[PDB]
């Protein structure tokens, strides 16, 4: 199955009841998909998923013929807690309908907002976030072996990190599996020894973050 | 205006290779193509083995994410090899994470 998926970063702002994600089967063969939304949390220092009724997708199953563009509706059931960002994964499963074959699962992030906070991907939500001190990721870092890097987000917005730097104008350091540090969450992940010691010779390090409109550097404080 | 990124994930075909002890191989075709003016990271996890590597020195560990990015296409190379199929067919689950 071949799918175009748009947007790859959907969100549901506070004053919205619903958003849409488009799935077009750009293949020559029909496909069937199961569509599900899971609550997403990083407790236990690892990504967890669970059943959820805060956001309901429609339809939950769909046949999408070759060339066909289907609209997923994603409905916020009731208002979400004030000032908070809720995190989810939207999951699309291709249903099957010496040779090994392939069966795709696509998983995209989905964020929804309560009053006082927004995605910052629009003017409205930008002005909302300007008046809110914590409408942003606020990151702290710490290394500890048994070498693992811990990242704690004190902000109310997730960070999406592609790289770490020891300085604003420096180069991104080694890092031979990490990206999302959800709001009010702390994530833990493995790093090389050389990485750990390199972080040891400093106290402020920097994330390349793409949660907002543009890529931007954010500062990470030592715990 | 502000670009909303979309990705095509196909790409746009499988791997084909008793009780003759030798080393057999094969390859397939999966791509990811976004449309930002900015690279997009994505992650691939696959649940007798399979590799991101021509010359097969980089395993898809069972359920372990494997890192990727793009620029305005990108292949998700898969290279198979065999000295947990059954009959012989296997069905592998490939998860592409944005």
Author numbering:
A (entry chain A): 1 to 97, 108 to 156, 161 to 190, 193 to 239
B (entry chain B): 7 to 18, 28 to 32, 43 to 44, 46 to 73, 93 to 117, 120 to 129, 131, 135 to 138, ...
Question: What text comes from the article?
Answer:
The biogenesis of CU fibres requires a periplasmic chaperone and outer membrane assembly platform termed the usher. Here, we report atomic-resolution insight into the structure and biogenesis of Acinetobacter baumannii Csu and Escherichia coli ECP pili assembled via the archaic and alternative pathways, respectively, whilst also highlighting some important deviations from the classical assembly mechanism.
Archaic Csu pili mediate the formation of Acinetobacter baumannii biofilms, which contribute to high rates of nosocomial infections. To gain insight into the structure and assembly of archaic CU pili, we determined the crystal structure of a CsuC-CsuA/B pre-assembly complex, composed of His6-CsuA/B and CsuC (to avoid polymerisation). The CsuC chaperone has a canonical Ig-like fold with two 7-stranded β sandwich domains (D1 and D2) oriented at ∼90° angle. Whilst the refinement statistics for the structure of the CsuC-CsuA/B complex are good, approximately 40% of the CsuA/B sequence was not evident in electron density maps, whilst another 7% has very poor electron density (Cα atom B-factors higher than 80 A2). The remaining structure of the CsuA/B subunit reveals a double β-sheet sandwich comprising strands A, B, and E (β-sheet 1) and C and F (β-sheet 2) and β-strand D, which switches between the sheets. Nevertheless, the ordered part of CsuA/B provides sufficient information to conclude that, as with classical systems this pilin has the incomplete Ig-like fold in a six-stranded β-sandwich, in which the absent 7th strand (G) leaves a large hydrophobic cleft. CsuA/B interacts predominantly with D1 of the chaperone CsuC via edge strands to form a closed “super-barrel” with a common core. Four large hydrophobic residues from the chaperone G1 strand (Val110, Phe112, Met114, Tyr116) are donated to the subunit to compensate for the missing G strand. The C-terminal carboxylate of Phe152 interacts with two highly conserved residues of CsuC.
